[PDB]
Amino acid sequence: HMTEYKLVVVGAAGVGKSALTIQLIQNHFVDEYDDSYRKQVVIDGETCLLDILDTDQYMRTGEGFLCVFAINNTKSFEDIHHYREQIKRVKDSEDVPMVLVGNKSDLPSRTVDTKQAQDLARSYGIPFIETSAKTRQGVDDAFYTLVREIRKHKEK
C-alpha cells in the first residue's frame, strides 16, 4: 500500500546533508551532529515511503540523488562535478534522477550566485533548488522535486 523511493544525499563535508535530512524528518534544525532514514509522506496523491541515505549498495541502488553544495562554500560547488561523475560512473547513464541543491540560503556570506548554479544545472539538464536547513526554506521542495524526477524517469 505504499511506494518506496530510495534517495541518496551527496556532497562535500559540511554542506548540510544531515541537517537537510533531519529537517525533513523531525522538522528541527540541528547545529551539532555526527545511516538511513524513513519518511512516509503523500506526494501528489501517492503515499510514499522515502528511504534516505545521508552519505556502494545505496550508491548503486539509489533511485535519485540530491547533489548538495553550500552557497557560501565555493569549493563545495566546484566539487559537484565530481559527485555527478561518480553517480554517472555507477549507472552507465547521463540521465539519472538528480536535483542540484544550494543550501545555507539564510547566510549572508554568499560566494556562489544563483546564476552560476542555474548555469550548472542547465548544463546537466536538472532542477536547481535553493534551501536553508535552518529556516526550512526549500527543503520539502527539494525532496518532492527529486521524487518527481524519479517518476519522470521510470514507472513506480
- Interaction site with ligand 9GM (CB under 6 A): 13-19, 30-31, 33-34, 103-104, 106-107, 132-134
Closest approach, Cβ 21 to ligand 9GM, in A, equals 8
Quick check: 101 binds Mg ion (CB under 5 A)?
A: no
Give the C-alpha separation, 134 to 104, whole Å. 7
DSSP 111-146: -S-HHHHHHHHHHHT--EEE--TTT-TTHHHHHHHH
Query: Which among Mg ion, ligand 9GM, none contacts residue 134 (Cβ within 5 to 8 A by kind)?
Result: ligand 9GM
Closest approach, Cβ 105 to ligand 9GM, in A, equals 7
Q: Which is nearer to ligand 9GM, 10 or 96 (CB)?
A: 10
Quick check: 18 binds Mg ion (CB under 5 A)?
A: yes
C-alpha cell at 30: 540541528
| Residue whose entry in the numeric block shows the C-alpha cell 534516505 | 52
